[model samples]
Target: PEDWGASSRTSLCFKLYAKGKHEKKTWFESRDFCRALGGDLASINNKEEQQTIWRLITASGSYHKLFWLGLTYGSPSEGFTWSDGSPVSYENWAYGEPNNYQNVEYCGELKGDPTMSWNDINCEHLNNWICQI
Candidate 1:
């Protein structure tokens, strides 16, 4: 794990869900949940990490639903930034790309979109998400 400190230092966090939670939630809700537990939505730092998340997305039954990813194209003035505030050195946008989709929709997705790709999304729409420790 990333050693984000002790439970008292922060809070408990995990990727796998606890047992008996027979329900899912929107990406935003997922983010909030992770934060409450001292984590954030999942992030991809390399190809191996990318593959791992891709597997999760495929294994999930929410194919028709958009899942959250830790990315931000942000606004044109600010350009683009990732959840960790680093420059985006790699990408996987599909053609006609990110067209900003009517000047709205700005969130990240790991499924339904191309591998390692991201798009602007309406954060209000419910979709799957990931949390980390």
Candidate 2:
């Protein structure tokens, strides 16, 4: 059977993930789903990784769609943290994004419009998400 999900194996690492139809799920639900699959929501570590995932999202026909990522900001000064507890050493936020609009935005997502940049949004809002292993 053909796998609908996309993946790659290279010198850097192995990747297997899917960005499919807009089945909306809250950030927490999406996180649980990914974890249940032995993976977690996508965690973009660097430009190379970010571009690679961006390509996957685009290839999934997810233009102009928001997708969750493995990042979150607990407080105004808490800074963003990765799902796996890795230090957040890189960022690619869109203009005026991660603004914590309404002071309720905490989860991170990759914005499809304006060219797949990053944004912070309220975690309760349901949206398409990406998972990685």
Candidate 3:
């Protein structure tokens, strides 16, 4: 929808799944779990995809919960990239996010808003995650 070089209809191809708990697994662990289940952490490519995930999370009763995405950053200077190796061409970061607070935040999440904007978190923090198959 934002001229992301792909059609909005592509969002329909995904079968989304939310798994684990807030204290269940770290981002990397959840990613591994998803991989074991025949999918990878959801890689959002556009606002429509982000919104669809928002609906999935809200329907799952995780409206105000932190949820992992397939995003990460190795260093503040290197910025962020999708776990699936897609280019960081589209983003929906919440205001002031990826601030690299204390320089430890390296993971990304849908955050806890119905707006479904993103936030960078610490990879070690456990939270539910979305898997894209």
Candidate 4:
């Protein structure tokens, strides 16, 4: 139930949660939670949006790596797209990511080791998530 500069004009507004101090959630669970709040998982199209998120994830505590996005993979032909149905216009992928490692990574994740860049991780992994209005 907290926010980071969402009330400002930049519209970089977002909420981050992992039960806040308890259990984390899978991509699906976190996605539903964002919708429950009347928003969807965070979606980025430009640098400001992306940079705001980078700062958001630098939350200085146990909220370590792994933030779920509205992004999901369909097939090799369809590729990844956001839940809001926005086309993949802008992307910031890690050096060698979106690997779909083992072909089981069907969800999008923003990680810490890579300084909050995008990676395709297994959907079942429990993680913190962000929402956008």
Candidate topping lDDT: 4
lDDT of 2 by residue, 35-78 (tens): 89888887878766776766665555657777888888854466
Q: Estimate, for each residue in 68-117, the C-alpha lDDT of model 1 and write its tens digit.
A: 66666666776656664646666665555656677766666654433546
TM-score for candidate 3: 0.79
Q: What is the TM-score of each candidate against the true structure?
A: 0.65, 0.79, 0.79, 0.81
- Worst ten-residue run, lDDT, model 3? 1-10
Q: Write the per-residue lDDT of candidate 4 for residues 1-133, one digit (tens) a residue.
A: 3444444465336766675535678889888888898889988787667766665666545445678888899667778989877887788788887888997999998774425678899999888888887
Model 3 residue 63 lDDT score: 59
Model 2, runs deviating above 4 Å = 1-22, 75-78
Evaluate all candidate structures by whole-model CA lDDT and list the values in order: 0.57, 0.73, 0.74, 0.76
Q: Write the per-residue lDDT of candidate 3 for residues 32-130, one digit (tens) a residue.
A: 988897878878887777667665655567557777889998545657888877777788899998787897888998775777778988899877777
Candidate 3 local distance difference test against the native: 0.74
- Using TM-score, give the best candidate's number: 4
| Clash pairs (backbone) in predicted model 3 | none
Question: Could you list the CA RMSD of all candidates, in the order they appear?
Answer: 6.8, 4.3, 5.0, 3.2
Once all C-alphas are superposed, what RMSD does model 4 give against the true structure? 3.2
Candidate 4, superposed: residue stretches over 4 Å from native: 1-8, 19-21, 59-64, 112-114
